[PDB]
Amino acid sequence: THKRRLSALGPGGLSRERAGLEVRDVHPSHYGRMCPIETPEGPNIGLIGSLSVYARVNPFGFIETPYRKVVDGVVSDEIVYLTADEEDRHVVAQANSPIDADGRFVEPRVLVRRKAGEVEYVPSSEVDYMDVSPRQMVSVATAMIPFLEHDDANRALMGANMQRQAVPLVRSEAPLVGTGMELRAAIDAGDVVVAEESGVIEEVSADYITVMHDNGTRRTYRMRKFARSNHGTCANQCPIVDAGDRVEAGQVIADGPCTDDGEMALGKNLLVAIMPWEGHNYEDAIILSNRLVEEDVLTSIHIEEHEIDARDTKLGAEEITRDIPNISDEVLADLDERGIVRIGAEVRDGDILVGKVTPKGETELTPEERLLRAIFGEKAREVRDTSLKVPHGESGKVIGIRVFSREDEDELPAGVNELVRVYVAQKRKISDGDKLAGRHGNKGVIGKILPVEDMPFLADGTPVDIILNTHGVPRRMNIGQILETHLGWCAHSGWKVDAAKGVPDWAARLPDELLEAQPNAIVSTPVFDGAQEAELQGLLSCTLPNRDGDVLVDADGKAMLFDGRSGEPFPYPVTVGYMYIMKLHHLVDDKIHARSTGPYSMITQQPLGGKAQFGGQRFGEMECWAMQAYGAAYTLQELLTIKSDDTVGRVKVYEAIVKGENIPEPGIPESFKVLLKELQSLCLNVE
């Protein structure tokens, strides 16, 4: 989706501030050339879009769209690619029209699209073009939402946008209910090793597959194991073929990051109840069981990359070695004889990664430092330590070490003799604060991770996994998640309708070999032509039992839960089923951030800003308005003097806190004196 993305900004295009309101809307010519769902939802709505599925670009740069041509009411198979203008020249039929299995419609009054984007009921002889299928007006990432036609447009926008922020888990189980777009969208994404030519498997391993073609020649496919992506995630690739198997051309031979057996897999399948539980799932919070923490269900790798370089200076050249001044030999036991750490060493927050020492020069010595050196006999140690230390809030093992050197004759920028890169990886679990979401815009952070015992278990001892909330469902108009939940329970338990007296009436248009299905069987309801209400309800009434004869879920889709905490049953049956949820890239460890005293700025004297540094929060303008409106003048004076700019005041504040005295009176900030010096510099006698 980063490819096939259509924008209007950039060079040669309109600016964001100069963006007209009319160019953000959906013109009626967008049907089949641009998705009216998938777009960013910040201050960039409609300026960035994605292509449609069946779309195509002309040699001139216009956007073509296929259409089924139809002559005399008989729908042919001649597919004609139209552009917008000759689309407007003709009249365009509907995708889901009842065709008589002979080319012709069953009603003369068909839905149709006129020239200027109008919707009419034309007689079925003026129709000269039909759509090829449904899902023509939709993008790729939006065509992977089951029951899209039941969701509102805003929540489908949020679901299609959050479907690509999912992270790759370590097990990557395929979804139960999906569309038919996972397989094609995976094997066209390029992250799956496809067999280039048909042949037989000679040898598999964890690192390479060598196949034997039909005529002599062999080819080996080198996998990528634990390669770092562009945003820290992992990119494993494992085979799925055995030793003696036979493959064909185009067959999937190795999984990718988010794939299972060929198709896409962005999350896991989890049992879910829709009850409001004790205020822990209040206002879109989510609670989970402890089974997901125990059994590594939502855990992912994260790989980070550090870097340091030994330049050359005026006084000499910085050297990479072990002889760090004034540092105990207890923390120098990890790294090897040449300074860098060894592969496999677990590091904490603040340990030494690359030993680096710089020349410093000569300075005068204070009498107290002179007397301590005279007492202890320690030498001067004229070189200064600037080593590479792992930043705050990080840990994990050390995967790889890549070192470039000047003596080994590689290309480097001028004056750099040694570049060394260390790859630290950690196995992040799930935790409270992390953000989860379904395929329908129903996001929400994790409120609490309960133990497995105090979690409302089913009628036969099975505990549920997540607990959603009811009040967020009806006022957001996305009951597609409820239909997905019911059909997920049906697809997990397995069904078998009874064809003793023929097929029942609700399953007449239901296709064959869905009259019975094994448990844990996958299905696919496509985007705009999928399950119906009568089909799903009749299929939910006949849903064969588990181990004993116990239909755990009645005909409405609900079940009689037990309270795992007190012990009594809940007095009313609760909707249960099997949803498909994904773990997002908004983890807490990239967000939690604090500062007592750290690095300061250079031009101004304010504390520096950003999570990459220690960083302080911006006490902005409206916050000053709130502090004035309360009347708290002293807190505002403190926040604007001795926490930002009073350069003689910060050391006195730290001294007063450490010694235990009262905080002294604030002075003039630095910004005001800078303003005074500028106004005096601009030939204005400010007095």
Binding site: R56, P66, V140, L514, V523
Partner: peptide, 27 residues
């Protein structure tokens, strides 16, 4: 269907579409 090593994912669709999806990176 039309991909050899595919998992059998049974569909609920009623319409038999003529045209398969094009190459997704042809643009």
């Amino acid at each position: 269907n039309s991909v050899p090593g595919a998992p059998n994912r049974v569909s609920f669709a009623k319409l038999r579409e003529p045209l398969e999806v094009p190459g997704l990176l042809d643009v």
